[PDB]
Ligand binder design. Structure first.
Ligand SMILES: Cc1cc(N)c2cc(NC(=O)Nc3ccc4nc(C)cc(N)c4c3)ccc2n1
Length: 257
């Protein structure tokens, strides 16, 4: 070291509140969640995504980076945004979501968006002790940020260690909270050797996170991709502020499959 990502993290931790709030959205893409949030406030159960996560996963799926099919397991499903998005996909036959829930954590949100009847979301489940199950698609969006990159390093490696027993001849999309710490890079290189895939930056991620996703389809140089993200995020500190690109949120429809 020290890595480009660690330099980015230092500068991020130096920002004031107003500088941070400007920087985190500068030049990013984001979905307009206003209508959806009002719908959830009213208890509406059709069309709305339960989180910004549905659109986030959609970005990967529309580029065939992960192609949900068959039995989908969603580790750390939270409200269920990834699960309910997958439930509407023709090739998907079953969605099982597991999440901790309870105090301080999001509970699954019951919905009747398209394909809801093939979704089972289970709260009260600690995925770090959950025996691996056969699945055709493995999703995991777990990783708690911290101002400390070393804390994030341990959290990230713990997530990667937990998800690996679930991976075998299947599609996957796994969040890598901190991909730039050298120990994480080494684990990712061994993981790519065992299971393939590639590390990709989602443009709906805010500039305040260096998160990248390990997706199953394709290949590439992990260090080069991480460093590309680090340079982008570093340059956005001094780039003139740019308003984010606002897109419409996803419409997940209604009814049973
Ligand atoms: C306040 C808050 C913030 C988040 N980013 C959350 C994410 C989630 N999504 C997750 O996957 N969370 C999560 C988060 C941390 C976890 N830790 C262990 C040891 C086991 C788990 N099954 C587990 C799950 C859930 C609740 C959240 N609550």
């Amino acid at each position: 070291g020290e890595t480009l990502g660690e330099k980015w993290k230092k500068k991020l931790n130096q920002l004031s509140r107003k500088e941070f709030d400007l920087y985190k959205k500068s030049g990013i893409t984001e979905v307009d969640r206003t209508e959806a949030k009002e719908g959830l406030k009213r208890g509406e159960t059709t069309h709305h995504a339960v989180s910004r996560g549905s659109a986030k996963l959609q970005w990967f799926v529309e580029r065939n980076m992960v192609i949900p099919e068959g039995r989908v397991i969603d580790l750390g499903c939270g409200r269920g945004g990834w699960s309910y998005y997958c439930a509407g996909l023709k090739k998907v036959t079953e969605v099982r979501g597991y999440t901790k829930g309870g105090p301080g954590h999001e509970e699954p949100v019951p919905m009747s968006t398209y394909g809801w009847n093939i979704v089972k979301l289970m709260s009260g489940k600690d995925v770090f002790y959950l025996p691996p199950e056969k699945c055709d698609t493995l999703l995991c969006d777990i990783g708690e940020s911290s101002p400390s990159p070393t804390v994030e390093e341990s959290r990230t490696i713990r997530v990667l260690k937990m998800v690996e027993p679930w991976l075998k001849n299947n599609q996957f999309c796994i969040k890598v909270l901190n991909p730039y710490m050298p120990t994480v890079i080494e684990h990712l290189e061994r993981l790519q050797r065992k299971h393939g895939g590639m590390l990709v930056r989602n443009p709906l991620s805010r500039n305040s996170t260096h998160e990248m996703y390990w997706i199953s389809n394709g290949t590439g140089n992990i260090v080069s991709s991480v460093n590309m993200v680090s340079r982008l995020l570093l340059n956005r500190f001094t780039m003139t502020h740019r308003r984010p690109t606002i897109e419409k949120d996803v419409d997940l429809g209604a009814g049973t499959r």
